[PDB]
Design a protein around this nucleic acid. Structure first.
Lengths: 89, 100, 92, 79, 205, 92, 99, 91
DNA sequence: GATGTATATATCTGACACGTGCCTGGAGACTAGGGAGTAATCCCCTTGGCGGTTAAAACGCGGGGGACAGCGCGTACGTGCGTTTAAGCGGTGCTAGAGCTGTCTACGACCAATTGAGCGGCCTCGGCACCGGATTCTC
DNA sequence: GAGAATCCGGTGCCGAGGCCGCTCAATTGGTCGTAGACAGCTCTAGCACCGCTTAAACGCACGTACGCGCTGTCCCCCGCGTTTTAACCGCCAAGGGGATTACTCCCTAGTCTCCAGGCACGTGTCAGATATATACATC
C-alpha cells in the first residue's frame, strides 16, 4: 500500500510544500517581527527558507520515527515529536 | 612564472593571499602558508568530485547534479563527520526504509 | 566584477575525469563549499596566532589547523600533500 | 483567513513519507503547524536584522544564508 | 502608545534630507520650538531621529499625525511619483464632503485610513491607506488624491495595490455630488503640466 | 603583569549588594564569563564589518550584535541601557 | 586627570576594552563610541546574573557566593538558560530534578 | 527505598564523583598513545579541568538518555537507550 | 496474471560548454624595520617515592520488582471515490528599490609626556565547614 | 509512634578583603589622511492581478491493523553484611624545562610599474525529460 509511495518520494528531489502558501506564511510571520513594515523578498531567498524548512522537518520526522520504533509503536503520536526536541536541545 | 604553476597547483594562490590580507586574520601573512592552503583545498575538492563523478557514472548520466553530491557525501564516512551539519539545496535524502 | 571559484573547480574536474560535465547549479554548491572551508581553517588558524601571542600566519599554523579541522585519514593525506606542494614551491 | 492551513493535511503526509514514517497519527496535523512556525521565527527575526542593518528593504538570499549559518544549520546551495 | 507608529515616523524622517528637515518640522506644527532648540542639528541622521522620537515618546502621538507628516512629505517630492487625472460630471462646503467620503469608504470596507489637509486654491490632499477586512491598513503604500472644490477634476497617485481603483472612483463619485467618472490618457510625472492642460481648457471653455 | 576582571566585578557586586562576599574561585568563573561574551559580540560584530564591505566598528554594529546574540527581554533591556550610557557619554 | 568610566557613568573599564578591541584584530578601524556601549552591555549582563545569584545566596542563609549559587541562578532563569546553554559551570552540580 | 535519599543527597553536594588517580592514569595512558616516545607533562589544574568536563558530560548524557525509558513505559536504562540518545544528537 | 517494472525512442527543449573582448588585479623589484629564532639561565613547578589510615570498592544472597509475551476490544486511520477549491502558467504593467558614482568632513590613527589606577605581596578575622545535639515523620 | 530527617550550636581554620609599593599603561593633546555619510540618477526584478485550467485537496463511508490495558511468568537488580584494598595525606628530594632577556638578521609590507588572466557576453547543439509503447517480475 504505502510502500510504493515511500520509494517514489525518496527518489525525486522537488519541493513538496507549495510555493505560494509558504510565501504567504513567510510574509505573515515577517510583518510581526519588524513593527508593521512590509519587505520585498527576492525570488531566490524563499527557496532557501523552503529548503531549510524541508530539511529540518525531514530530519525531525526521521528522529521522531526512530523514537516510535523504540516503544513498540508504529504510529507516530504527538508525544513523540515533543520529545525529540528536548533531547536535541 | 605564475605562483599557481610554480608550485604545480590548480587553485589560485594570489587570490587566497588577497583574501588572507583583507580578511582580518593576522597583522602579517607569511609566504609559505597560502600555497599550503590552496593545496589542501584542491585535495578536498578532488576528494568530493571523485565520489560525485563515480556516483553520476553509476546512474548512467553524463552530468553532475546535487542529488549525486548528496549521495556521495552521505555514503562516505569521513565527509559524514566533516559535513555533519550541512543541508544541501535540491538535496533529497538517502533511501532509508526500516521495519519493526 | 563579482568573482567566484567556478573555473578552478571545472579545471580540477577535467583533470581527474575525462568528460564528466557539471551543471550550473551544483557548481554553485562547490562555491559555497570552498568559500566555507577557507572560512574555517584560515579563520581558526588565526585563533592560533592569538593564543601563542604572535602576529603572523606561517605554514605551521595552517598545518595545525588542518590537523584539527579534519578527521583522521583525510587529515593525514592532506598534510602529506601540502608539504609536498610547499617543497616544490621553495626551490622555485 | 486560515493563514497556516496553507500547510495542508497531505503536505505533512508527503514530508512524513520522505522521512519514512508508515502511519501518521491524528493530532500531528495540529502539532507540526506549531513547530515549523517557531522555527521560521528563529530564522526570520534573525534574518530581518541583517537587512535592517544595511539600509535595505530587500531581504536577499545571502541574509537568510547568514542567519542559517548563525543558527548552526549551514545551507550551501544558494548565494 | 502603540509601538508601530514610531517606526513609521522614524522611517519618514530618515527619508527626509537634512536640507529642509527643519522646514518640515516647522511646517508640521506638532512639537514645541524649545524642543527644536534642544535637538542638535549637527550630528548624523541616525541619532537626530532617535532624539526626535524620544521627544514624541513622551508628549503625544497617533496614526493621524504621522499620516499628516506623510502628507507634508509627499507634498514636497512630486518629482518621484507619477500622477493620473480623473474628472467627474453629471451634476459647496468641503466639511460635508469629508464626512460623506469618510463614511462611505468606512462602510465600503472594514479597515481604511483617511487623512485630509487643507491647501490654497481650495485644494485638499487626501491620503488613503487601503486594507482588507482582516488585516491592518498598509501605511507604506498610500494613495493620494488631489481634489479641488471648484473644478470637477482630481489628480490621482498610482500605487502597487490596484483592484480598489473602481471602488475608490465610485465611492468618490457618490461622495461628491456626481454620477460619472472618467479616466483620461493623462499620466505624467509633473503636476504643473497636468494643471496647465486642465486649466487652459477649463478656464477658457 | 597578567590582568583580569576581578576588581570591576567586585565593585559591581558591592554596588548592587551591601555586603555579599564572593569567593576567590567563583570570581574566576566571572572572568571566564566576561572574557567570553566579549569574545562573542566584539567577534561577531566584526563579521558585520565584512558582509557590508566596511572597515569600522561603530556603536550601530555593536547594537545589532547585541540584538542577535541575546534572547528577547534581556536584549531589549541591554539595548535600552547602552544608548542611555552613550547619550550621557556624548555630552561630556 | 579624568576617568573614562566616570564620563561613562559605568563601572567596567573603557580603555581596556578599547585596547583589546584594537589588539584583537577584529577590524582595522575602531569607532570611538563602540567600547563604551559594549562595556555597558557587559555591566548589565554581569549585574543581572549577580542580582539573580545573591537572592539564592541569601536563600541558603549564606553571604559568600559559591559556584553552586551561580549554577542555580543560571539554570532557574529562562532567558539566561537560553543564553548559557552549552556551558558547564565548574564545581556546579545539577538542579534538583526528579521524574 | 534508599535511592530516594541518594538522589536527594547527590544532587545537593557538588563534589567529584570520580577518584583522582585512576582518572589521571587513564588520561596519561590515552596521552601516551598519541605522538609516541616522549612523555607529556600535565599541570595539576588541567586534569581537574578535564575531569570536571567529563563528569558534566556523563551526567548530562545519563539524564538525557533516561527520558527514553519513561517513554517506553520501562523504568530501567538499557544500552539501546544510550546508543539511541547518541544517535539523536550526532556526536 | 494483471499490475506494475524496466527499456527504446521521439523529439523537443533549453542549459551549457565554449570562443571572444576586455578591464584590472596579480607578478617583478626593493628597500626597512619590527618579529622572531637562537642562546643562556634560574627558578619553580612537577615527578617519584615512603609510609600509614581509612573510606571505599568487591563479593555472596535473596527477594521483591519489573520486563516481557500473549490477547481481546475497539477505535482511530488508510483507502476509494466524486467534488470543488485553490494553486500554477503566463502575461502585463510598472514602479519601488539596489547600487553606484562623486564629495567633503568629521573622525580616528599616530605620537610625545605624565601620572595614578590597578597589579603583586601580606595579614589578619569573620565566614564557614564539620562535629555533636535537640525536635519531627511516616508503616 | 520510634530509627530516620531537620535544625542548632560550638570550635578550629583558612581563605577574602583591607593595606602598601610601585610601574607601566592609560590619558591628554595636537596632526593629517581618509572612510564613510549623503544625494541623485539609473536599470531591474518583484509585486499585484487576472484568466484559465486542472491537479490536488476535501469530505465522507467504510473495513480493519494496531493501541492499549491486563495478566501470568520468570529472571534479575538492590540492599545488606563481611572482607579486602588502594586512594589519599603529608613529606622530601631533585631535576626538567618554563619563563625571561639579548641580539642579530631576515622576511614580510609598501609603493611603484607592467601585462596576462578571469569575468561578462553571446550561441550553436547535445543531454535529458517526459511521454508513449512494449518486453519481464511477481503475491
Amino acid at each position: 500500500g504505502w510502500l510504493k509511495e515511500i520509494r517514489k518520494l525518496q527518489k525525486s528531489t522537488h519541493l513538496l510544500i507549495r510555493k505560494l502558501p509558504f510565501s504567504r506564511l513567510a510574509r505573515e510571520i515577517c510583518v510581526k517581527f519588524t513593527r508593521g513594515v512590509d519587505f520585498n523578498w527576492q525570488a531566490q531567498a524563499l527557496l532557501a527558507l523552503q529548503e531549510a524548512a524541508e530539511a529540518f522537518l525531514v530530519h525531525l520526522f526521521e528522529d521522531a520515527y526512530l523514537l516510535t520504533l523504540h516503544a513498540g509503536r508504529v504510529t507516530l503520536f504527538p508525544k513523540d515529536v515533543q520529545l525529540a526536541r528536548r533531547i536535541r536541545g | 612564472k605564475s605562483r599557481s604553476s610554480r608550485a604545480g597547483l590548480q587553485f589560485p594562490v594570489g587570490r587566497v593571499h588577497r583574501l588572507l590580507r583583507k580578511g582580518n586574520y593576522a597583522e602579517r601573512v607569511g609566504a609559505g602558508a597560502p600555497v599550503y592552503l590552496a593545496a589542501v583545498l584542491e585535495y578536498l575538492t578532488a576528494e568530493i568530485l571523485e565520489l560525485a563523478g563515480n556516483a553520476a557514472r553509476d546512474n548512467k548520466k553524463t552530468r553532475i547534479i546535487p542529488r549525486h553530491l548528496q549521495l556521495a557525501i552521505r555514503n562516505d564516512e569521513e565527509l559524514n563527520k566533516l559535513l555533519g551539519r550541512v543541508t544541501i539545496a535540491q538535496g533529497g535524502v538517502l533511501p532509508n526504509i526500516q521495519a519493526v | 566584477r563579482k568573482e567566484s571559484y567556478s573555473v578552478y573547480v571545472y579545471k580540477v574536474l577535467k583533470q581527474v575525469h575525462p568528460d564528466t560535465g557539471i551543471s550550473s547549479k551544483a557548481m554553485g554548491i562547490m562555491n559555497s563549499f570552498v568559500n566555507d572551508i577557507f572560512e574555517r581553517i584560515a579563520g581558526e588558524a588565526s585563533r592560533l596566532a592569538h593564543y601563542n601571542k604572535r602576529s603572523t600566519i606561517t605554514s605551521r599554523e595552517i598545518q595545525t589547523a588542518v590537523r584539527l579541522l579534519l578527521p583522521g585519514e583525510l587529515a593525514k593525506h592532506a598534510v602529506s600533500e601540502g608539504t609536498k606542494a610547499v617543497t616544490k614551491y621553495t626551490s622555485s | 483567513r486560515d493563514n497556516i492551513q496553507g500547510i495542508t493535511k497531505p503536505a505533512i503526509r508527503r514530508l512524513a513519507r520522505r522521512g519514512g514514517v508508515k502511519r501518521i497519527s491524528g493530532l500531528i496535523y495540529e502539532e507540526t503547524r506549531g513547530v515549523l512556525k517557531v522555527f521560521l521565527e528563529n530564522v526570520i527575526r534573525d534574518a530581518v536584522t541583517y537587512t535592517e542593518h544595511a539600509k535595505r528593504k530587500t531581504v536577499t538570499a545571502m541574509d537568510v544564508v547568514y542567519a542559517l549559518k548563525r543558527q548552526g544549520r549551514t545551507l550551501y546551495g544558494f548565494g | 502608545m502603540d509601538e508601530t507608529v514610531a517606526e513609521f515616523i522614524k522611517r519618514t524622517i530618515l527619508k527626509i534630507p537634512m536640507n529642509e528637515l527643519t522646514t518640515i518640522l516647522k511646517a508640521w506644527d506638532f512639537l514645541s520650538e524649545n524642543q527644536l532648540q534642544t535637538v542638535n542639528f549637527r550630528q548624523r541622521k541616525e541619532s537626530v531621529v532617535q532624539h526626535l522620537i524620544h521627544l514624541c515618546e513622551e508628549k503625544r502621538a497617533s496614526i493621524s499625525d504621522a499620516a499628516l507628516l506623510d502628507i507634508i512629505y509627499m507634498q514636497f517630492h512630486q518629482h518621484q511619483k507619477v500622477w493620473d487625472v480623473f474628472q467627474m460630471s453629471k451634476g459647496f462646503d468641503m466639511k460635508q464632503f469629508k464626512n460623506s467620503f469618510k463614511k462611505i469608504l468606512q462602510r465600503a470596507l472594514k479597515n481604511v485610513t483617511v487623512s485630509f489637509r487643507e491647501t490654497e486654491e481650495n485644494a485638499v490632499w487626501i491620503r488613503i491607506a487601503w486594507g482588507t477586512q482582516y488585516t491592518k491598513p498598509n501605511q507604506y503604500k498610500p494613495t493620494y488624491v488631489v481634489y479641488y472644490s471648484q473644478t470637477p477634476y482630481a489628480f490621482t497617485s498610482s500605487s502597487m495595490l490596484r483592484r480598489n481603483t473602481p471602488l475608490l472612483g465610485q465611492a468618490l463619485t457618490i461622495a461628491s455630488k456626481h454620477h460619472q467618472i472618467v479616466k483620461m490618457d493623462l499620466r505624467s510625472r509633473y503636476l504643473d503640466s497636468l494643471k496647465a492642460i486642465v486649466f487652459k481648457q477649463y478656464n477658457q471653455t
